[PDB]
Structure formats: C-alpha cells, structure tokens
Paper text:
Conjugative type IV secretion systems (T4SS) mediate bacterial conjugation, a process that enables the unidirectional exchange of genetic materials between a donor and a recipient bacterial cell. Bacterial conjugation is the primary means by which antibiotic resistance genes spread among bacterial populations. The recent cryo-electron microscopy (cryo-EM) structure of the conjugative Type 4 Secretion System (T4SS) encoded by the plasmid R388 revealed that the remaining VirB proteins form a large assembly organised into four sub-complexes: the outer membrane core complex (OMCC), the stalk, the arches and the inner membrane complex (IMC). Previously, we solved the cryo-electron microscopy (cryo-EM) structure of a conjugative T4SS. In this article, based on additional data, we present a more complete T4SS cryo-EM structure than that published earlier.
The OMCC is made of TrwH/VirB7, TrwF/VirB9 and TrwE/VirB10 (in this study, we use both the R388 Trw and Agrobacterium VirB naming nomenclatures). It is itself composed of two parts: the 14-fold symmetrical O-layer embedded within the outer membrane (OM) and the 16-fold symmetrical I-layer beneath it. Intriguingly, O- and I-layers are formed of the same proteins: to only mention R388, the O-layer is formed of the CTD of both TrwF/virB9 and TrwE/VirB10, while the I-layer is formed of the NTD of these same proteins. From the work presented here emerges a more detailed description of the VirB10 protein. Two sequences have been described earlier: one termed VirB10O-layer (residues 177–395; also known as VirB10CTD (see below)) which together with VirB9CTD and full-length VirB7 forms the O-layer and also forms the T4SS channel through the OM, and another (residue 135–153) referred to as ‘VirB10I-layer’ which forms an α-helix that interacts with VirB9NTD. One additional fact emerging from this and earlier studies is that VirB10 only contains one folded domain, VirB10CTD, functionally overlapping with VirB10O-layer.
Residue numbers in the entry:
A (entry chain A): 177 to 331, 349 to 395
B (entry chain E), F (entry chain B): 136 to 266
C (entry chain F), H (entry chain C): 17 to 44
D (entry chain D): 199 to 331, 349 to 395
E (entry chain n): 177 to 247
G (entry chain k): 177 to 198
Write the structure that this text describes.
C-alpha cells in the first residue's frame, strides 16, 4: 500500500555516502585550505563603486610541513569587491584573486578576505546616510507645521519624500594600512616553481 | 640521484645545528590551559602541552593589544607541540572561556634573517620554474 | 546601544615562568 | 556488519575542536577549527585523527528573525601527518545542539529608530504649532525586515558530528612492536 | 533514500579546485596587476553628461623588477 | 650573442657604480613598526626592516600633508628591504593602527636625471618596435 | 559537489586578459 | 554631521635618527 502519506514521507531515509581518507602529495610544496595569510591593506576602501583592492603580505608563508617559505613577505595580493552593502550590513565581501611573489611566482588563489581575527568580509566605519534618508521628510513636516502655525496666528508630502529616499544603502569606509587576513579557500601547489637543495657544509 | 638529493635535504632538515634557544617566557591567566614548556629558536615559537591537556587556540597580540590569527603547525612525536611561525613579545592562549597570556621576556627585534627560503639554514629553495 | 561582548581578558597578577624544567626537545 | 573497525569512524561520532576564526554572519564565509583531542576508531584502539588537525568549513545564508544559531558545514580535515578526508558534516555546539550560536545583534535601532524619530518630530511639531496661542508607517515598512547578526568569539569550543562513515584503510596500517 | 530534504541539501559539499603556481616570463618588460599609476587630472570633471577624461602621469612607472622605465 | 647581451645587461645592473647615498633620515611616531635603516640613492628610497618585524605599508606625503600610494618593490636577500620608486621629503609608515613618520633631512629637489630609461646609468632602454 | 551556492558564486574568479604594448 | 574618521596621525615629539648604524647594503 501507498497510504500513510505524511508519516510515510517523514520516514524516508537520508542515506549519506561514506568517505575515504586520502593523503597529500608533497607537503613541502603545498599550502592547504584554511591557511591564514596576514597582509596589510594598501588601498583605502570605500564601497560606493565596485573596485579593486590591494594588500601586501606582512609575513612569510610556510608550507604545511612548515619547512619551506612558499610566499615571501612583501608579496602583492590583488582582489576586488562589488555589490555594495545592504541595510543592516557592516561588512563587505572581498575576493582576493592573485598573489605575486617578489621573485616572480604567480598563483591564482580565489579566496575570501576576512578581518584580523578571521571574521568574514572587510569592515570599517559605516555611513548610514541618516540625513539623506530622513531630512526631506523632517524638513517637509517642519515647514508644514510652521506654515500651519503662521496661518493660525492670523487672529502626505512627508510620506512621499520618505518613500523615495528611505532606501539608500550604507557606505563602508576602511582606512589604508589596516591589517587583514586571506583565508585560503583551495589547495595551492608550488611543485612546478620551486625545488630544494642541500647546502654544502662549511 | 634525486633520491640522494632528497636524503640530503631530509638530513639537512633534521640536523638542526647552530640554533639558539630562548626560554624566557612568563604566563598569567587561566593556568589550567597552560603549556608545560614554551621556547623559541629565533624563527618559530614552540608551546608544549601535556598528554592529558586539550590543545588550545593561540593568538598573536600586537602592541595595542589586538589579537590576530597566526599560522601554526603541530609537531612532536605525540603531536604535543604547537609551533607558530612567528616570534612575538606577547601571545594569547584561549580554550573555550579561559584565557592565558604568554610574555616573551627576551624578545629580540632583529632575529635572524631568512636568506635561504626554508626553515633551515642548510637548504636553499631554488627557482625551478625558470621562465 | 549594545555591542558584541569581548572575549575574557586574562588577569595580569599571577605572572610566573612557563618553563619549570628545560624541555627535552632542546636536548637538555 | 562493519568491515574493519580499527580503520573506521562511524556516523554520530563527536569531534571536539576549538574555533580559530571569529565568526560574524554578515557575509558568507569560511570557518576553521583545530581538534583538541585525538579521535580513536570505533573499536577504540587506533588514533585516526590526531589532535591539532585542522578542519575547514563554511556557512552561508545568514539568520532569519527569531533564529539564534547558524548552520555550519565542516568540509575537510587535515591531519598533521598529511592525511586528508572529506567529511561533510554539521557543526554543533559543545553539547551537540545544531548550529553555532553566540551573541545576537537584532538591530533594534536600525529597525525602529526611523519610525520613532519620525513620530517624535511629528508630535513635537504639532505641539509647537498648537502653542501658537503615515510617514512613520512608511519608515517602519522599509526597515522592519533586517535579519539579525550572530557574533561568536574566537577560541570557543565546538563539536563536529560525523554525518557519514569515514574509512582510513588506505592510509594507515598496524604493526606489532618488538618486545624490549 | 532521498529523504531529509532540508538537512541533505545543507550538507551538499562545496568542492573548490586547487591552483598551481606559475612564473612570470620577463619581469623587466612587465607591469603587473595592482600597480598604482599616479597621474594628474587635466580635465575638469562634471558628471551631468557622459564624457571622456584625460590625465598625465606625474612619475615614471618602472617594471615589476624595478629596473626599466616602462611608462 | 643574445646571451652575451643579457649577461652584459645583468652585469651592468649589478655593478652599481658611481652612486651617492643619503642617510639623513629622522623618524617620529610608533617606533615598534620602524625600519632599522633608511636611505636613498638619489632615485629610490630604501627602508630595511628586521627579520622579526612585519612589513608595513608606506605612503607618500605631499606638502599639504595628504597621503598617496607610491609603487614599491621588495628587494634584499631575505626580502627585508622595501624600495619605493620616488625620493620625497616626508614618508608615512602604517601597520594596523600604528603610524610612523619618516623625514628626509637632506632632500635634494634636483636629483639626478634619468637619461637612459632604466634604473641604472649603464643600460639604455632602446625602441625595438620601430614603426 | 555543487553546494555552498552563495559562497561558491561569490568566489567565482574574474580573469582579465592582459595587454601588449604597440 | 558625521564624517569618516581619519587614520592616526603620528606624534611629532620623539624625533630621532633612523640609522643608528650604516647599512651593509651600502657596503659600509
């Protein structure tokens, strides 16, 4: 039978496929997901228009084995943001796109930019445009009341103004020189550009 | 021949010669999440934890007191050592709602330069890609 | 009028050495 | 019957890890945590995931009104010795309650201040006009629906509840130690 | 089974492809992304109508190696 | 033959002869992000930082005090030198919420002209494209 | 997998072709 | 009535030479 429709559809199993452990190939030429890249913001960031950001690594980035410097300090990272903010948001999504090593190594990391403690997006000072959103309505109401008072002393436009200018998205301002992190979203492989050699002793 | 080169590289990494160790570390705060040993070799800082201790989260503290993430690798025979890739005057250790501050009392601003591109002074990192 | 609470700041009173003994990884 | 219970972590195993990143749900993003303890096999004899292993996850979608917990999916764990397994499992609290939760910012002022201010200025103007001898609804209708924001501090304890069977047969093997 | 629809769709993995490092060809004849070109605005800009702007570089722009003046 | 020309170009770049160095640099502000050495050769300004120091962001300060971006290249054996492509009386160094001002106390407005199109007086840049 | 729809679409790269001087 | 805050301006009191020693890159 096919009855018991509600109870029979709440009893449909959820079968999740198992996983098998693998192993990373070369952990000396590897930067894995979830590595934190600490860089200093060069450009001042204002989210009025879509644009491109730039930061420089403040520290050397080692491999997952922790033995080879894969990204040197002073490496330049280029990213971009778009879309602006919505009401109630205080952080913008920044995607870092490419990093250039001072020795000429280039890798396309397309990773999310974060704050100094890894919170998602870049955040700074927020301009909510209070006056541009409410000044028309406030001014219209006050002039209406003043005119009514003057007319009485002889012995809705405010809603229209508010409806048009109430929805102005906020603007984020982030100062130059601020510390940011790049959280690596994919595995970065440096096997094709570096190799190791032992130093002759003394 | 490449096996010979790899063996030489591993031997150079293991030999670990000419290293100075700084042991001047103080701590204040929640001592229940404290390491049993902390030191640095001039490039990395090592915190050793006991077998029965949970491994906490370690944070980098700047001059103004702001915390930031620092990369870490877990080393040791029993994964009891957290190695952070920086030498810093002050560290923050957090596990849940407990915090502990670690102070480097012999901080050397100069450090030792990394001329080779590796964690060891006995291995060059060389540019294979050419181009 | 309400902001995100900060994580606990450790007290700076009971400041003591971390290393009671030399680590054996230092080979000492 | 399960095949090899020494190279196995089954569903419903609790992985206790410490949150590294500070979590703010304004934008979609990626989280990161480290295992605080060794994870043994179902037989309880082999350490399959070492302590200090790094777990990477992500969240998205934000919160809705009345919600105080965000859904986090942990995607991959990396062992300090180089073992990688793709566990796509739900993140929970310290006692296994679904989702990560922290302090919630409900944006009371951003939702009601326009209406309150409009009403108060309207009443003040009416009072001043009388002393000679709806805009508030429009403001509220536009800004009433602002989703809350969750803040979770760094260093907080979390669990990963394993949603599938994890098999380690291809990366480990056991050997007896010669006595003395 | 295909049940658990909401929980099963929040557990769909996000698999991001890895990247491989390459190398720039000639860093003496190259200006890479993210280089800042400092120029002085010639025209006065008023955004009433769409239009064209013009500026002049105030400084020499070097290569990524920092050895050849490219602009 | 082209390998010979390339070797000659590299030798000319490395030889670095007939260079005058200005070392009159002062600093005020947050000394924890300060360089250990600053100088210029008449064309570029070099700030050297220690091994344990984070590399900060460096800004160009004009007469009115407005900051602007200046291109930089990272040089040195251990990437410890930031070379900015300008000589300026005043510089601004920022890292996070710390700022440091660098003052060139021997600023030469004239400088030395760049007649060759390269950073060295021993290499011409020549117009290959013809057209 | 094709999940993580919002985060995966904010991480789509923007690849701009280079230019050659004439 | 509210404007974007400026970055910190360094104090102009503790003005001291940058170069305590001649750099070795100058070969001196």
């Amino acid at each position: 039978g096919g009855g018991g429709g509600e109870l029979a559809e709440k009893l449909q199993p959820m079968r999740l496929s198992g996983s098998s452990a693998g192993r990373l190939g070369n952990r000396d030429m590897l930067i894995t997901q979830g590595t934190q890249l600490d860089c200093v913001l060069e450009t001042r960031l204002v989210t009025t228009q879509p644009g491109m950001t730039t930061c420089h690594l403040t520290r050397d980035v080692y491999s997952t084995s922790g033995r080879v410097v894969l990204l040197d300090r002073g490496s330049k990272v280029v990213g971009f943001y778009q879309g602006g903010l919505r009401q109630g948001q205080a952080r913008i999504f920044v995607q870092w796109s490419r990093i250039e090593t001072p020795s000429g190594v280039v890798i396309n990391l397309d990773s999310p930019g974060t704050g100094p403690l890894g919170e998602a997006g870049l955040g700074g000072w927020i301009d909510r445009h209070f006056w541009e959103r409410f000044g028309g309505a406030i001014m219209i109401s006050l002039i209406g009341d003043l005119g009514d008072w003057a007319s009485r002393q002889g012995s809705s436009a405010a809603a229209e103004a508010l409806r048009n200018s109430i929805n102005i998205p906020p603007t984020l301002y982030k100062n130059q020189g601020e510390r940011v992190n790049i959280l690596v979203a994919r595995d970065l492989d440096f096997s094709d550009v570096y190799s190791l050699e032992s130093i002759p002793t003394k | 021949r490449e096996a010979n080169a790899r063996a030489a590289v591993e031997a150079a990494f293991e030999q670990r010669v000419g290293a100075y160790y700084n042991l001047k570390y103080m701590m204040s705060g929640d001592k229940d999440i404290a390491p049993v040993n902390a030191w640095d070799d001039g490039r990395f800082t090592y915190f050793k934890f006991s077998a029965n201790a949970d491994l906490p989260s370690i944070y980098f503290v700047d001059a103004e007191g702001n915390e930031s993430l620092v990369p870490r690798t877990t080393v040791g025979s029993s994964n009891n050592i957290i190695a952070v890739h920086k030498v810093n005057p002050k560290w923050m250790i957090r596990l849940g709602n407990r915090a502990l501050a670690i102070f480097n009392e012999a901080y050397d601003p100069n450090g030792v330069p990394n001329d080779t591109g590796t964690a060891s002074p006995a291995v060059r990192r060389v540019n294979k890609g050419g181009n | 009028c309400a902001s995100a609470p900060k994580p606990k700041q450790p007290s700076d009173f009971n400041r003591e050495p971390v290393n009671k003994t030399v680590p054996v990884e230092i080979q000492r």
